Write an enzyme that holds these catalytic residues in place. Structure first.
Site, PDB file in Angstrom:
ATOM      1  N   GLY A  27       0.696  -1.101   0.189  1.00 29.41           N
ATOM      2  CA  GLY A  27       0.066   0.088   0.096  1.00 29.41           C
ATOM      3  C   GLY A  27       0.733   1.282  -0.099  1.00 29.41           C
ATOM      4  O   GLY A  27       1.972   1.419  -0.486  1.00 29.41           O
ATOM      5  N   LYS A  49      10.616  -6.379  -1.519  1.00 27.03           N
ATOM      6  CA  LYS A  49      11.068  -4.916  -2.202  1.00 27.03           C
ATOM      7  C   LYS A  49      11.656  -5.417  -3.617  1.00 27.03           C
ATOM      8  O   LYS A  49      12.344  -6.446  -3.565  1.00 27.03           O
ATOM      9  CB  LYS A  49      12.069  -4.028  -1.602  1.00 27.03           C
ATOM     10  CG  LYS A  49      12.251  -2.604  -2.279  1.00 27.03           C
ATOM     11  CD  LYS A  49      12.813  -1.984  -1.329  1.00 27.03           C
ATOM     12  CE  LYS A  49      12.963  -0.534  -1.837  1.00 27.03           C
ATOM     13  NZ  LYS A  49      13.991   0.311  -0.778  1.00 27.03           N
ATOM     14  N   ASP A 145      17.453  11.397   7.081  1.00 26.56           N
ATOM     15  CA  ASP A 145      16.077  11.226   6.378  1.00 26.56           C
ATOM     16  C   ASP A 145      15.340  10.246   7.041  1.00 26.56           C
ATOM     17  O   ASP A 145      14.516   9.397   6.328  1.00 26.56           O
ATOM     18  CB  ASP A 145      16.578  10.998   4.888  1.00 26.56           C
ATOM     19  CG  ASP A 145      15.204  10.984   4.119  1.00 26.56           C
ATOM     20  OD1 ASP A 145      14.271  11.819   4.467  1.00 26.56           O
ATOM     21  OD2 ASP A 145      14.974   9.989   3.469  1.00 26.56           O
TER      22      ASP A 145
END
Ligand SMILES: Oc1ccc(-c2cnc3ccc4ccncc4c3c2)cc1
Ligand SMILES: [Cl-]
Length: 342
Positions: A27, A49, A145
């Site tokens: 999602g 992935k 990050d």
């Protein structure tokens, strides 16, 4: 009798080992072309992935490599672990896609953040981020990050950071959690990630991104507006050009943390909640600090009353993970291919 098989997931085709089945789109929590899958072998759901031709551009190849390499290397509870990596292709020539298999959590922080603020849970998570972040730091890795979309958690509140952030060095770039020194392109140190954690913690309380912006401009204003203008010491560290823009920004004293994160965002019954609300704001106040020179560190944050309770030496004092040279497409394909081929 091929050991692989392709499964159309969303607009992507995952060709994975038969062990991985029931592939489904993770999602919005998908950090890339990632999907949920059942690992028949490990009888464990996994996130697969897919990296299509990682070696295409430079930056990507480098990042994908660094990621893959690190993920293999690190082994820490708060850093996503690499359950398995593979490619359908049997040769460097044919080589195209790379599939990283890793434990599947139940949500990422975005989701969690929207949950009703619970101190044990928020505390634990934060502790866990600091941990991971500490491990990364202890390896010379400074995320810079950290964002809710790249941190996931299990039902038992196990928190894991998905990626190893930037490497020593803005479309689809959640900048809402980037420390000021980053945004403003100044140097940085480990505590640059404390900012990110502050933004997240604060958001968990406020339930709204602390520093939303259509870009960095708005962001900075939202920042200063709430945390007040940074001290000249900070300004001075700003590149001549930037400092000019920043220093010439409207002067804000900035809202106090009690006001930035009112008592109505916290539980009010028990004195425990009263104290925890205070600690929460306190911590927040020590993390959501523009000037990194004045921003709390991971250890101090870890030793803060709010996170204190979970502190476990063994975990925190866990030894660092066991390069930075540029390359060419054809060269990255091999590097990555080999790495995938272990
Ligand atoms: O609703 C959601 C939201 C997020 C996830 C979830 C859980 N685990 C993981 C684990 C590794 C991941 C690696 C890369 N991208 C996403 C996830 C991931 C996403 C699952 C369901
Ligand atoms: Cl300051």
């Amino acid at each position: 009798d091929n050991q692989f098989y392709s499964v159309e997931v969303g607009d992507s085709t995952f060709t994975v080992l038969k062990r991985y089945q029931n592939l489904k789109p993770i999602g919005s929590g998908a950090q890339g072309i990632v999907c949920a899958a059942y690992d028949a072998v490990l009888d464990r759901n996994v996130a697969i992935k897919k990296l299509s031709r990682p070696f295409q551009n430079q930056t990507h190849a480098k990042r994908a490599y660094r990621e893959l390499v690190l993920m293999k290397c690190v082994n820490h509870k708060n850093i996503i672990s690499l359950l398995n990596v593979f490619t359908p292709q049997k040769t460097l020539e044919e080589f195209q896609d790379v599939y990283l298999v890793m434990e599947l959590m139940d949500a990422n922080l975005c989701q969690v953040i929207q949950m009703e603020l619970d101190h044990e849970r928020m505390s634990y998570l934060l502790y866990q981020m600091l941990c991971g972040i500490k491990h990364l730091h202890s390896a010379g890795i400074i995320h810079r990050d950290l964002k809710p979309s790249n941190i996931v958690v299990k039902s038992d509140c196990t928190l894991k950071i998905l990626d190893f952030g930037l490497a020593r060095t803005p479309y689809v770039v959640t900048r809402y959690y980037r420390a000021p020194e980053v945004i403003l392109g100044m140097g940085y140190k480990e505590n640059v990630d404390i900012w990110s954690v502050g933004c997240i913690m604060g958001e968990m309380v406020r339930h709204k991104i602390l520093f939303p912006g259509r870009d960095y401009i708005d962001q900075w204003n939202k920042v200063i507006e709430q945390l007040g203008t940074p001290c000249p010491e900070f300004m001075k560290k700003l590149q001549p050009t930037v400092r000019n823009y920043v220093e010439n920004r409207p002067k804000y004293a900035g809202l106090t943390f009690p006001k930035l994160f009112p008592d109505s965002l916290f539980p009010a019954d028990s004195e425990h909640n009263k104290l925890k609300a205070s600690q929460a704001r306190d911590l927040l106040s020590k993390m959501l600090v523009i000037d990194p020179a004045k921003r709390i560190s991971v250890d101090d944050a870890l030793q803060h009353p709010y996170i204190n309770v979970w502190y476990d030496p063994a975990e925190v004092e866990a030894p660092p993970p066991q390069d930075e040279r540029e390359h060419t497409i054809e060269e990255w394909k091999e590097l990555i291919y080999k790495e995938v081929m272990n």
